[PDB]
């Protein structure tokens, strides 16, 4: 009966004027799967910070809080089935996001919250706002149904060394709960490990080291789409991984420094 626009997903992450990272790549990827999505920016950059220059910044708490609240006040969540989180600007955004999410669950008992704990890697460590980690551990993590950390991020979230697979698995297992259903850990091959309370599925893709950014965001985008379209978890992870590899190939064949989406 609502006359408002609806969406299957609310994607909360970065946005670039130029480039294919955050919602700039996730939205069209999600659209490709035949799903609707409202994108809520956490940062608005001209391009990723990896280039010689970059401009823009974090979306003000008041604006950010307003964007989320507006989706409710506009009654545009009648079809909401998932909320994905990616690159966050500040801890304050995470706390606000968590509060918004806690509020939603009361009306969307089946809401699938998928969070990508973008914090960093092992080379210099945390390449995002220093206060993000604690914010993830305190407010957001407790709400996630699934998470997609890399080794370093799983270590920061669990406070456990995860260099060895068996160690990463135990760490991921220790995170599972009535709320947290799965942990997808990403590690010349790429290792993607799917962990649930009763299983562990290791997926290895022959991947070549690239400088292309946003693949993690593309990954999560294709993953949630698959889960929402009825794909079993592992299959959904594998397909997401394959779509990413495919896009990277298409992009390189296109001789482009930014991800370009081929048809699905």
């Amino acid at each position: 009966k609502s006359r408002a626009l609806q969406a299957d997903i609310v994607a909360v992450q970065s946005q670039v004027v130029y480039g294919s990272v955050g919602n700039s790549i996730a939205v069209p990827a999600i659209k490709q799967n035949g799903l609707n999505v409202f994108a809520v920016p956490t940062v608005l950059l001209s391009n990723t910070p990896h280039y010689d220059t970059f401009y823009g910044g974090a979306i003000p708490d008041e604006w950010f809080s307003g964007y989320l609240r507006a989706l409710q006040e506009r009654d545009a969540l009648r079809q909401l089935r998932a909320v994905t989180t990616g690159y966050m600007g500040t801890a304050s955004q995470i706390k606000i996001l968590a509060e918004w999410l806690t509020a939603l669950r009361k009306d969307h008992p089946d809401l699938l919250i998928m969070v990508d704990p973008v914090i960093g890697d092992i080379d210099s460590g945390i390449y995002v706002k220093p206060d993000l980690p604690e914010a993830y551990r305190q407010y957001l993590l407790p709400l996630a149904q699934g998470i997609t950390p890399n080794i370093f991020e799983l270590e920061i979230l669990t406070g456990k060394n995860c260099r060895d697979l068996d160690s990463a698995i135990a760490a991921a297992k220790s995170l599972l709960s009535d709320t947290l259903k799965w942990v997808v850990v990403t590690s010349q091959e790429m290792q993607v490990v799917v962990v649930t309370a009763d299983s562990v599925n290791v997926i290895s893709h022959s991947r070549v080291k690239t400088d292309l950014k946003g693949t993690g965001d593309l990954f999560c985008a294709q993953l949630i789409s698959g889960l929402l379209k009825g794909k079993a978890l592992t299959d959904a992870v594998h397909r997401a991984g394959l779509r990413v590899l495919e896009v990277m190939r298409y992009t390189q064949q296109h001789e482009s420094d930014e991800l370009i989406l081929p048809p699905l």
Copy 2:
């Protein structure tokens, strides 16, 4: 379009258009409707926001604001530094957040014009609603750079300070804005139930008029959509009047479709 035949291959994304307007998390106004419409036409575009709102200020609540000058200027500068303008054929302007953004945009444009002689700068003089600052910014900075403008009667009067309450006068004012740079003026007036969309296309050598019938609606963004389809039409070979006519029909088509689905926000049907 870059004239450097000797330029090496750029690996950056390329775009035919750079649309500078508002953006809404929820809704179909500004680039939120223009980008998808442009995409439908098979063109590429870079969206540079002037304001990032939760939705239009027409609803009961709305949040967000104007993009800071530093960010705004940076976004425009980044497009140059990323070398993503080799295919740039046009820059459209819509709702501007502040006069300072207009100055910043204009400076960026003057610079660009030097490397893109074929640049079609199309300006939509969004002034007014249902502030001295904005009108003057347009007159000093953007007006002297535009190749074409799409004002309604009120905006045409504001920019020129002339009375345009009759065909001849409206034409006269539009003609007065023409120059070696300003090639055309598209003035429209919604007569309000079945609102009539009166349109007058004015150039140095001709005057053409278009008239569409429209059902009264609260739908927002139709003007931004019109512009998106206009620039798209022009970039795909359509002659001015033909492009204006088609842009108007496409808008009507989108509005009907929107109503057909009983939506309070524009939704694009196939093209």
